[model samples]
Target: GAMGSSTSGLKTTKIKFYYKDDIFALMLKGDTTYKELRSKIAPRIDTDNFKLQTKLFDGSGEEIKTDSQVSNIIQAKLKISVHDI
Candidate 1:
């Protein structure tokens, strides 16, 4: 991937899971959504679309790209979440 102030301004979503008390904060959190393959987690930076397109594959035998020479992203899913400061 790319890096720099440009990426800094990218404003990636940051999250903190509330499962445990000592939750790790200040995290650019993102999780996998099975139904829609979208981000099931929210972030601090406001965003839209959350990329409803899957960056990778799921259990549908998408591990290997059949029509391509190399493994590639194939599926997508949707998710629900919120942003907390």
Candidate 2:
């Protein structure tokens, strides 16, 4: 597992793959190895004006998956949500 500093005013995301007790792989979507699919969203991701959504993409590049639990994290935007009622 690893975390990297994101450029200012840009969205930073990480993808990690695991098989239960085993970590298979990890990578950032826009990292050197893979071109981030959200280059357009990146520059604005880190801003409060834009809502950063940590949508996870599967290996097939489909964010909507019925079997998402079986697949690994291929892309992510790292968003956190909190509700106080």
Candidate 3:
């Protein structure tokens, strides 16, 4: 992985997960996708993709999937949710 702030104006966004009473959030590059987030999220929650499914919020009634991009989902701020499969 590259060191700190690899790109200037390289902004990062935060995606949050809610489980029970806890909130797990990650700071990611604006271009991040649910595919990439899955891996990172797994360890934090002590699980893996085989046992988890990623869900994204688009501010609509529909939730997006792993292939969805964060930039497309959240313009500036957003959240993510993971559930057991």
Candidate 4:
């Protein structure tokens, strides 16, 4: 029974990015990977000089890999810190 699938899994989640003393809101679907998130927000925040790395904060507090699938990362409001290195 595929009932209430939206709530049961990672549907569309909203993530708040903290960068340069300002906060930005981005809505990404369940299938969105860490790699895509970086690309999507790269140009928006000056992509040339800095490299972007994403950390998916859940109970584990682990750094999510680029190719890793995000549907299992259970969260509604994920906080992403854009580190420039």
Candidate 5:
């Protein structure tokens, strides 16, 4: 006989944000949006004239400019950079 199905809920991961010479670690859910991310980091640093960016395997990076892209690329222990725009 088979038992009931098993499923897991949303998971949380720590993401490190680099700003100047400091690193800000924030916990985020798998489905967190870019807007939500910004709001969380806003209190830790000044984000008014800065942009968020992350690097790929090639060492090249791009700005995180949309909510949809948050869950698409962000992962556990991922490092993000805050750059002046």
Candidate 6:
């Protein structure tokens, strides 16, 4: 038998929200909503005028529009960019 690192089910997704040069790390559940994400980041930045976007491989991002599951668009240790709307 070979020794290996076991993988476990993911209960939460680790994300780094980039608000300009500042970064906010958060653990989000699979069912986490976009609305909830705004509230979680409210203390750090004003959520009213800003929007969240998922960072893509091409350096471009898509704005999160609906209150859908966050884990669907983000992966563990992924970076999300917050932009002014």
TM-score of predicted model 2?
0.22
Q: Which digits, one per residue and each the tens of the lDDT, describe model 6 over residues 1-85?
A: 3337222325567777777667787777565678788877776666567777776655537666565535555444457777766
Top model number, TM-score: 6
lDDT of each residue in 9-80, candidate 4, tens digit only? 455677666555555756766666666766766765676333332445432233444535333332544465
For model 2, residues 33-70, the per-residue Cα lDDT tens digits are 22232332334243222221123333223332222311
- Which of 3 and 6 is the better model by lDDT? 6
Model 1 stretches with alpha carbons more than 4 Å out = 1-10, 26-85
Model 1, position 6: C-alpha lDDT score: 46
lDDT (C-alpha, whole model) for all candidates = 0.26, 0.29, 0.53, 0.53, 0.63, 0.65
Q: What TM-score against the true fold does each predicted structure earn?
A: 0.20, 0.22, 0.57, 0.59, 0.68, 0.69
Q: Let me know the TM-score candidate 1 reaches against the reference structure.
A: 0.20
Model 5 spans with C-alpha error above 4 angstroms: 1-10, 55-60
Candidate with better TM-score, 1 vs 6: 6
- Candidate 4 matches the true fold with a TM-score of 0.59
Per-candidate clashes, comma-separated: 5, 1, 0, 0, 0, 0
Cα distance off (Å), candidate 6, residue 54 = 0.8
Q: What 10-residue stretch in candidate 3 is worst by lDDT? A: 50-59
Better of 4 and 5 by lDDT: 5
Residue 38 displacement (Å), model 4: 1.0
Question: For candidate 5, lDDT tens digit of each residue in 1-85?
Answer: 2336221213566667776666687666665788888887776676556666774544325667686555554553457776555
The alpha-carbon lDDT assigned to residue 56 of candidate 4 equals 50
Indicate the residue-level lDDT of 1 in model 3. Answer: 40
For candidate 6, give the lDDT of residue 21.
Answer: 69
